[PDB]
Write a protein that binds this ligand. Sequence first.
Ligand SMILES: Nc1ncnc2c1ncn2[C@@H]1O[C@H](COP(=O)(O)O)[C@@H](O)[C@H]1O
Lengths: 113, 115
Amino acid sequence: GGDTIFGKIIRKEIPAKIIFEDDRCLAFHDISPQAPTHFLVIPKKHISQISVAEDDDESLLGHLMIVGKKCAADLGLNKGYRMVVNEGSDGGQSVYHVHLAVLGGRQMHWPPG
Amino acid sequence: RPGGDTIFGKIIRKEIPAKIIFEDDRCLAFHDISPQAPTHFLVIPKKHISQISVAEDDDESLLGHLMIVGKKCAADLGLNKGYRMVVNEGSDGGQSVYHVHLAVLGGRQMHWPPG
Ligand SMILES: Nc1ncnc2c1ncn2[C@@H]1O[C@H](COP(=O)(O)O)[C@@H](O)[C@H]1O
């Protein structure tokens, strides 16, 4: 899905530790984990950033969050977690393919960066 | 009651004040009273859902709508350099109000890790 490293991961051209897959998204552990559990849920559709998501994408974006919730439960995050979507330079977005990050296994702090 | 028992339900029913950015039949966006960035607002469903870990499969479109409204509000507020969206779940997530909400923070460089 697209011209980024996340596209390569979706196409199985480079490895990742995959947690879950369906016909429209992929969940996998982040290569630079910031918490004992840290994974990403990404759409297979190449949406470059949340700021350009269209109205028709509403269901899909919600699906990323539901899949994120389910994977977090499966990975034993019973004390909680934080979901994060980064947009643009101020948001610290590292790849221009929409991704929902899920972090847990430790106390998350405030402010969130 | 429509909106639930938390302070966010009271905000939905206009029983306590808020600085509202956007409102429709499914959600409400309003500024945070303890901002952690120069712009910091919340997008919440009008349907009470306590936390994302108990959201139902059928809540998918609603959850996505929070994100679309979040990004539209960010644009309308001039966050052209970007922003961070956050959902806190439970104790480790730092959740304090058990009515699910998407926080949007911007107007400064956000750092990594995100807490
Ligand atoms: N009356 C209020 N109006 C606006 N924001 C509030 C109010 N009470 C609490 N908050 C914010 O709601 C957020 C709760 O999110 P969390 O702590 O992640 O559950 C915090 O950022 C609070 O500052």
